Design an enzyme around this catalytic site. Structure first.
Site, mmCIF file in Angstrom:
data_model
loop_
_atom_site.group_PDB
_atom_site.id
_atom_site.type_symbol
_atom_site.label_atom_id
_atom_site.label_comp_id
_atom_site.label_asym_id
_atom_site.label_seq_id
_atom_site.Cartn_x
_atom_site.Cartn_y
_atom_site.Cartn_z
ATOM 1 N N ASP A 24 0.780 -1.080 -0.151
ATOM 2 C CA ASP A 24 0.021 0.056 -0.154
ATOM 3 C C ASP A 24 0.778 1.128 -0.040
ATOM 4 O OD1 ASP A 24 -2.382 1.235 -0.120
ATOM 5 O OD2 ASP A 24 -2.687 1.241 2.138
ATOM 6 N N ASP A 77 -3.309 -3.260 -2.466
ATOM 7 C CA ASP A 77 -4.352 -2.022 -2.618
ATOM 8 C C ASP A 77 -3.891 -1.276 -3.857
ATOM 9 O OD1 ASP A 77 -6.661 -0.704 -1.926
ATOM 10 O OD2 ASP A 77 -5.514 0.943 -0.927
HETATM 11 C C1 LIG Z 1 8.649 2.236 3.533
HETATM 12 C C2 LIG Z 1 7.744 2.921 2.220
HETATM 13 C C3 LIG Z 1 6.658 3.549 2.722
HETATM 14 C C4 LIG Z 1 6.078 4.138 1.667
HETATM 15 C C5 LIG Z 1 4.692 4.637 1.878
HETATM 16 N N1 LIG Z 1 4.164 5.204 3.264
HETATM 17 N N2 LIG Z 1 2.824 5.621 2.639
HETATM 18 C C6 LIG Z 1 2.532 5.670 1.526
HETATM 19 C C7 LIG Z 1 1.225 5.733 0.896
HETATM 20 C C8 LIG Z 1 1.087 5.521 -0.408
HETATM 21 N N3 LIG Z 1 -0.332 5.252 -1.015
HETATM 22 C C9 LIG Z 1 -0.876 6.169 -2.036
HETATM 23 O O1 LIG Z 1 -0.124 7.118 -2.795
HETATM 24 C C10 LIG Z 1 -2.278 6.092 -2.370
HETATM 25 C C11 LIG Z 1 -2.946 7.045 -3.329
HETATM 26 C C12 LIG Z 1 -4.398 6.988 -3.246
HETATM 27 C C13 LIG Z 1 -4.991 7.836 -4.336
HETATM 28 C C14 LIG Z 1 -4.378 9.446 -4.446
HETATM 29 C C15 LIG Z 1 -5.282 10.093 -5.152
HETATM 30 C C16 LIG Z 1 -6.144 9.819 -6.080
HETATM 31 F F1 LIG Z 1 -6.779 10.777 -6.752
HETATM 32 C C17 LIG Z 1 -6.781 8.356 -5.873
HETATM 33 C C18 LIG Z 1 -6.134 7.598 -5.264
HETATM 34 C C19 LIG Z 1 -5.099 6.025 -2.879
HETATM 35 C C20 LIG Z 1 -4.470 4.796 -1.891
HETATM 36 O O2 LIG Z 1 -5.210 3.908 -1.323
HETATM 37 C C21 LIG Z 1 -3.057 4.969 -1.767
HETATM 38 O O3 LIG Z 1 -2.579 3.943 -1.036
HETATM 39 N N4 LIG Z 1 3.769 5.324 0.927
HETATM 40 C C22 LIG Z 1 6.719 4.428 0.434
HETATM 41 C C23 LIG Z 1 8.078 3.843 0.342
HETATM 42 N N5 LIG Z 1 8.519 2.989 1.444
HETATM 43 CL CL LIG Z 2 -4.771 2.726 5.413
HETATM 44 MG MG LIG Z 3 -3.924 2.360 -0.904
#
Ligand SMILES: Cc1cc(-c2n[nH]c(CCNC(=O)c3cc(-c4ccc(F)cc4)cc(O)c3O)n2)ccn1
Ligand SMILES: [Cl-]
Ligand SMILES: [Mg+2]
Ligand SMILES: [Cl-]
Length: 213
Positions: free
Chosen positions: A139, A167
């Site tokens: 995710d 996800d």
């Molecule tokens: C340890 C490590 C950790 C990470 C890390 N930590 N936290 C994350 C979060 C990443 N999640 C997303 O960007 C995400 C985006 C959308 C979305 C956005 C905009 C829209 F219009 C439509 C959908 C929806 C979702 O459900 C998402 O999960 N990455 C990264 C690297 N290394």
């Molecule tokens: Cl979450």
């Molecule tokens: Mg997500």
């Protein structure tokens, strides 16, 4: 303050300490009525719950904690003694996740690591005494699903039957990951169609069960 701080405050003021279900409900209410946020949400969360119950994993890795919604969702269904490790790159969000888990009473089950997946995955064995993972929830950055799956395998962290659950395979989408796991004899895949959190937009989870080399 930030949206994430507002979500945490709302939970603290509208949920019951030590009651994970009330925490999930408070987050979903806030994100439906006040401000959208990228939590997995209730629609996809119900699918996650059904998967966690089927497999009763002893050791789960989560890539991308955000505010801890999914970590609360998974950890509340883990058996006594089972554990979740979750990685979060944004330090402010890592601190929110820790506080969220503390409020929920799940802090003994979960370790929240602050850092990038590409840096932390290679440390899992020697630093966090991981042998192999039972389940991985992906995710994090959508560009990283495929490279980190390959890195997990390289590091010897996957076993026959490890469950990958991803996800956002439709929105924002993870096209390289999906093509790869669906085309690989090393994975048995299933798609669970659902909706983007808090929105009437199709999204889905992919389950990819690792089969060995
Ligand atoms: C340890 C490590 C950790 C990470 C890390 N930590 N936290 C994350 C979060 C990443 N999640 C997303 O960007 C995400 C985006 C959308 C979305 C956005 C905009 C829209 F219009 C439509 C959908 C929806 C979702 O459900 C998402 O999960 N990455 C990264 C690297 N290394
Ligand atoms: Cl979450
Ligand atoms: Mg997500
Ligand atoms: Cl939802």
């Amino acid at each position: 303050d930030t949206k994430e701080q507002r979500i945490l405050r709302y939970v603290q003021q509208n949920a019951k300490p030590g009651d994970p279900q009330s925490v999930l409900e408070a987050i979903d209410t806030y994100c439906t009525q006040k401000e959208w946020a990228m939590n997995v949400g209730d629609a996809k969360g119900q699918i996650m719950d059904a998967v966690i119950r089927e497999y009763s994993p002893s050791l789960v890795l989560e890539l991308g904690a955000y505010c801890g919604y999914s970590a609360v969702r998974m950890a509340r269904l883990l058996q006594p003694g089972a554990r979740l490790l979750t990685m979060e790159i944004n330090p402010d969000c890592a601190a929110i996740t820790q506080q969220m888990l503390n409020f929920a009473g799940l802090q003994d089950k979960v370790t929240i690591l602050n850092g990038a997946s590409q840096d932390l995955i290679p440390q899992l064995k020697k630093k966090y005494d991981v042998d192999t993972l039972d389940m991985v929830f992906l995710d994090h950055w959508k560009d990283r699903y495929l490279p980190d799956t390959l890195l997990l395998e390289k590091c010897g962290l996957l076993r026959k039957g490890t469950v990958l659950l991803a996800d956002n395979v439709i929105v924002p989408g993870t096209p390289d990951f999906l093509a790869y796991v669906r085309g690989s004899s090393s994975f048995e895949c299933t798609h669970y169609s659902s909706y983007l959190e808090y929105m009437k937009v199709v999204d889905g989870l992919e389950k990819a069960i690792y089969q060995g080399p």
